[PDB]
Amino acid sequence: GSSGSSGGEKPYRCDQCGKAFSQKGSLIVHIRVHTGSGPSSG
């Protein structure tokens, strides 16, 4: 019951939403929500 608890301190951190990832690819699958990434139907 207490927000604000960063854990990992990874280099991969999206500035669009403010998230963190351990790998690069993992982040690539997230960009789909921000910028047109890979296929996503019409």
4: CB partners within 8 A, 6+ apart: none
| Residues at the interface with Zn ion (CB under 5 A) | 14, 16-17
Check whether 24 is labelled as a binding-site residue: yes
Q: Is 5 marked as a binding-site residue?
A: no
Output the smallest distance, CB 14 to Zn ion, in A.
3
Rounded to 5 degrees, φ, ψ at 4 are: 65, 90
CB 2, min distance to Zn ion, A: 23
Closest alpha carbon to 31 in 9, 5, 13: 13
Known binding-site residues for Zn(2+) equal 21, 24
Known binding-site residues equal 21, 24
